[PDB]
């Protein structure tokens with residue numbers, strides 16, 4: 547089973563919402579959906595995910611981006627700079643997933659930079675083991 | 678051989694010490710030990726590790742977190758902000774390990790945020806190849 | 809096929825150039841070349857890469873580091889701090905590569921810290937799937 551994806555944000559996002567990474571570069575298995583921003587598991591197993599979300603510079607001082615499995619937070623990150631500089635909220639996880647499980651990044655608050663085609667803000671993952 | 682782990686810090690750590698990540702989410706192979714903070718290799722091979730350690734905000738300006746293999750530093754990271762903002766010391770490695778080799782993250786100095794169940798500060802790794 | 813590498817920067821780099829990571833720790837497959845700073849694919853397939861580039865502290869406020877596939881940017885990152893503190897430009901990708909494809913990190917501008925043997929600034933990658 548080949549499952550591996552990588553997407554850039556493209557569009558700026560601000561405020562509480564799912565980050566819908568819309569510049570999809572790689573998507574083996576077709577399990578990442580840019581319309582919803584969710585990776586949906588169809589092969590149960592253990593997966594690696596990582597994300598790097600760039601806080602917009604020049605306007606705002608804090609930004610929170612968390613990785614979720616279904617309802618639940620499984621990693622948290624903050625970017626913060628009192629001078630309103632660009633900075634990243636990034637983290638990585640390894641999670642076991644059942645078929646139907648959704649994994650996605652949520653913006654808790656603050657402003658994420660959408661870098662158009664530049665892929666400043668990213669979300670990727672792949673299956674390590676199949677059950 | 679299935680070896681893959683992911684743990685959050687949970688408890689705040691400050692000053693020189695091994696970071697004992699105590700919120701263990703995934704631990705295929707049972708090779709990560711929260712009591713010691715160490716991953717101990719039992720299957721010789723080549724491994725990926727990554728860590729993301731959040732510096733506490735509101736008190737302190739620098740924090741250093743390094744990945745060690747046995748005695749030796751194999752990656753270094755610093756978080757620094759003169760306004761005492763949250764920021765991350767993060768890095769990633771690929772290392773060959775022999776049976777008995779220990780891999781762990783050490784706090785060299787500064788204050789790491791323990792995010793309780795929020796998994797702000799993290800350590801993960803998995804085997805890529807078995808010898 | 810075993811392909812997996814990890815290298816530290818070692819030497820300081822400043823201004824537009826390819827980052828030639830010269831402290832090579834792991835290099836299964838011998839596909840990373842410190843002389844050029846490039847990973848060259850010989851086994852077509854899908855690959856994971858990550859990089860963590862530390863901006864020098866005490867002199868300068870911004871630094872840009874991008875991952876390239878051949879001519880083209882496939883991930884971008886910025887480090888920025890108005891007080892001239894250390895900060896990281898980091899990102900991760902998953903890319904399909906054909907034989908002959910080159911992957912490397914370019915410094916677009918600013919000053920990257922070469923940490924000698926300390927491995928503050930790093931580049932790693934491995935093959936997930938072979939075609």
Ligand SMILES: [Cl-]
Nearest residue numbers: 673674805936
């Ligand atoms: Cl793998």
Ligand SMILES: [Cl-]
Nearest residue numbers: 629759760891
């Ligand atoms: Cl100031």
Ligand SMILES: [Mg+2]
Nearest residue numbers: 610612622654
């Ligand atoms: Mg949160």
Ligand SMILES: [Mg+2]
Nearest residue numbers: 741743753785
């Ligand atoms: Mg150190």
Ligand SMILES: [Mg+2]
Nearest residue numbers: 872874884916
């Ligand atoms: Mg650029």
Ligand code: NI
Nearest residue numbers: 627633764895
């Ligand atoms: Ni910062």
Ligand code: NI
Nearest residue numbers: 627758759889
């Ligand atoms: Ni700052």
